[PDB]
Design a protein around this ligand. Structure first.
Ligand SMILES: N[C@@H](CCCC(=O)N[C@@H](CS)C(=O)N[C@@H](C(=O)O)C1CC1)C(=O)O
Ligand SMILES: [Fe+2]
Length: 329
């Protein structure tokens, strides 16, 4: 068997309030989890995840092949050269099971200064036809802001955990410019399930997505109640329990950089499971020009021998590297 990973449930509700002592007690729990397996479940987060799941299912199960081409990123549709990040990521029946829809900051409109400048990693979202998907765009944009709010609260907790003032990360995480993305991933049930869509780990475990560290500051994830994730620990890969009432939180490699690996970006992978399910990550990314000076909370003077890295540089390079390592999703 595989051992169960320690993934504590942390009540994050004080991070929305003004009880500073209570916030510190939450920060300590985040610190402990970040130093152990690198994962925890945020509970009492205030988001209606059942409705998120229902609206997402309605979208995934009603979108047609025609609409998928019309929304497709450039990896699938050469006509859409502006769509590197945002849009539809098609399955390939017989070869690739997973499919998804990615969207970015709703404030990236045609008149946004970064859109006008054609700055890398900024795109205007594409949406299906409103008549075919009534309410979907509005729901999805509102969801972005709901999970942005949770993420801002979580970032106050991580800042306090690291010995900083609570706005240390959040001051770089702003509605007008965040590079954060939502991805609505569908993992299908298939009978037969094509072997070409199943990868195999060195230890023999059947996978849908190989080992990686996240390209993010933190990752704020909702998934269906079907166990699939594993995290590498000193004791080997361990199973992360599912919990479709909470958000699974972990650090990405930008956090590891900024903290000199005090909070590591945990290595994790996705087991192959033949089940119809949802994986709905929010990747907490800062602004394109955001730079936090690296530090080390294990060193008396707090100094680090790492060089500052702008978030835009980090992100553009990280997303390409992840595609090169683990394949186009
Ligand atoms: N397209 C997105 C980035 C996608 C990065 C990516 O492919 N991530 C993987 C590894 S974290 C991913 O989303 N995998 C999901 C899965 O396979 O279920 C995860 C975290 C829920 C953007 O432009 O921001
Ligand atoms: Fe990941």
């Amino acid at each position: 068997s595989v051992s169960k990973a320690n993934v504590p449930k942390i009540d994050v509700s004080p991070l929305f309030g003004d009880d500073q002592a209570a916030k510190m007690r939450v920060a300590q729990q985040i610190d402990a989890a970040s130093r152990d397996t690198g994962f925890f479940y945020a509970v009492n987060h205030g988001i209606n995840v059942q409705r998120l799941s229902q609206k997402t299912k309605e979208f995934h199960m009603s979108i047609t092949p025609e609409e998928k081409w019309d929304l497709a990123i450039r990896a699938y549709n050469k006509e859409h050269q502006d769509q590197v990040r945002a849009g539809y990521y098609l399955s390939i029946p017989g070869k690739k099971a997973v499919e998804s829809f990615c969207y970015l900051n709703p404030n990236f409109t045609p008149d946004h200064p970064r859109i006008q400048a054609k700055t890398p990693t900024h795109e205007v979202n594409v949406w299906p036809d409103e008549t075919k998907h009534p309410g979907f765009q509005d729901f999805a944009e509102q969801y972005y802001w709901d999970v942005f709010g949770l993420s801002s609260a979580l970032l106050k907790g991580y800042a306090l955990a690291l010995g900083k003032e609570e706005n240390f990360f959040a001051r770089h995480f702003k509605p007008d410019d965040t590079l954060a993305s939502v991805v609505l991933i569908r993992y299908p049930y298939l009978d037969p399930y094509p072997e070409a869509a199943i990868k195999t780990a060195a230890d023999g475990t059947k996978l849908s997505f190989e080992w990686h560290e996240d390209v993010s500051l933190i990752t704020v994830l909702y998934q269906s109640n079907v166990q699939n994730l594993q995290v590498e620990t000193a004791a080997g890969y361990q199973d992360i329990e599912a919990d479709d009432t909470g958000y699974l939180i972990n650090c990405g490699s930008y956090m590891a950089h900024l903290t000199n690996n005090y909070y590591k970006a945990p290595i994790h992978r996705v087991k192959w499971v033949n089940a119809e399910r949802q994986s709905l990550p929010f990747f907490v990314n800062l602004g394109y020009d955001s730079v936090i000076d690296p530090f080390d909370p294990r060193e008396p003077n707090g100094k680090s021998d790492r060089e500052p890295l702008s978030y835009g540089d980090y992100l553009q390079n990280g997303l390409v590297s992840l595609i090169n390592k683990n394949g186009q999703t």
